[PDB]
Design a protein around this ligand. Structure first.
Ligand SMILES: [Cu+2]
Ligand SMILES: [Cu+2]
Ligand SMILES: [Cu+2]
Ligand SMILES: [Cu+2]
Lengths: 128, 128, 128, 128
């Protein structure tokens, strides 16, 4: 509530929400991710990455090839509007970003870049 | 909250939740399912089916064998605790079941049986 | 292997391959598609659509709007480099294309345009 | 074809097949597994475990609890009919079993027990 959202990635690779509504009146928007489970980073690590539905696929392919020290994200990926760290069981991670990096008339996708998870852990973000 | 749940399945095959908690004092429990999108039942229909985590894959395999006229649920499946019918977008359906068919301790999966969707349209139900 | 590849889309909405590699010494490349399941193409149809990684989302969204009768592909779409027809279990379709249309350094993604199938029925294709 | 199939787990967490049919004329059936991508065993290793459609939840649960060191498989698990070792890209493994351990009319699921992979890396097996 306000200009933030608390989201969870479980051991079953599913976020607890498929949709995030960003109110255009927010100057900044924060996402507080938690990985409630028992599995660790290297096996079920989850990050929350934000891209345009159109770049997502390249973000994902590239992120896969970047490894864990990279959090499965390509360093200095212009396509990545925002992201948290790859966390694991019990760790938390927040991210704050400028809402002005977002424009209406665009479809944004949030997902996780850990190899193979994007197929299940993803959703939509809209500026309304 | 209390003794009902309203859930939505959308056009990307995801349920709006992946955890349902049934209070042990509800005599009955009602699951209200709706389908937001723009897609027809034969292409993107959902149903909500409840079964033990054990029976889920057999109910899911026997379901697509049953075809669209059977809501992709074998009829009289003994492993199905409760189910709605397959709804296309624009539709809705409620199912009201007896809380005495569930034992605490035991694990339950809710899911969709439409061909290949249970891979993403699934979650857990807990008597609490 | 050679200058052609056999691909299968099944009843679970998955392709047997998620990575293809075209040898530069191939003038053309042939994709032979089949559908090893039991379901109809109005329920579980599959096509093989080739676009760049960047254009995938557009072709898919534009494609799901043109419905069945148009094989879920927007006609005369300029992002589609090559495609098959939508087939059902039991059907077949191959498409030969010009390798000269691919360029080294670009990221191509193959997918199926049927509603929701690209969630798993997708893969990368690269020149080599 | 004949009394064996070649299966393959990739970097997307999928098998090239989700349906196996063991003919009643096979005295032994063989599964040759492979891992066509390039991620390692600790990130994306996969195995091939056969059990009844009924026993799959548990094998999988006791298995992800056992650890990589144990091929994520409960040592001396009874519900497991056959299985290979966990392989990473580049590696191969095979398992041959007697068709006598299987019966007609019963439903089996082949799968991978590496944490979370059975969500997609799963299939059916029937003696025909
Ligand atoms: Cu994840
Ligand atoms: Cu569904
Ligand atoms: Cu398809
Ligand atoms: Cu695996």
């Amino acid at each position: 509530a306000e200009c933030s959202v608390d989201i969870q990635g479980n051991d079953q690779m599913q976020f607890n929400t498929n949709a995030i509504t960003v109110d255009k009146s927010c100057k900044q928007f924060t996402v507080n991710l938690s990985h409630p489970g028992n599995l660790p980073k290297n096996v079920m690590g989850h990050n929350w990455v934000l891209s345009t539905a159109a770049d997502m696929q390249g973000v994902v392919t590239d992120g896969m090839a970047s490894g864990l020290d990279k959090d499965y994200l390509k360093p200095d990926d212009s396509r990545v509007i925002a992201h948290t760290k790859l966390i694991g069981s019990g760790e938390k991670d927040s991210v704050t970003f400028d809402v002005s990096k977002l424009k209406e008339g665009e479809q944004y996708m949030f997902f996780c870049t850990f190899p193979g998870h994007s197929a299940l852990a993803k959703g939509t973000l809209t500026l309304k």
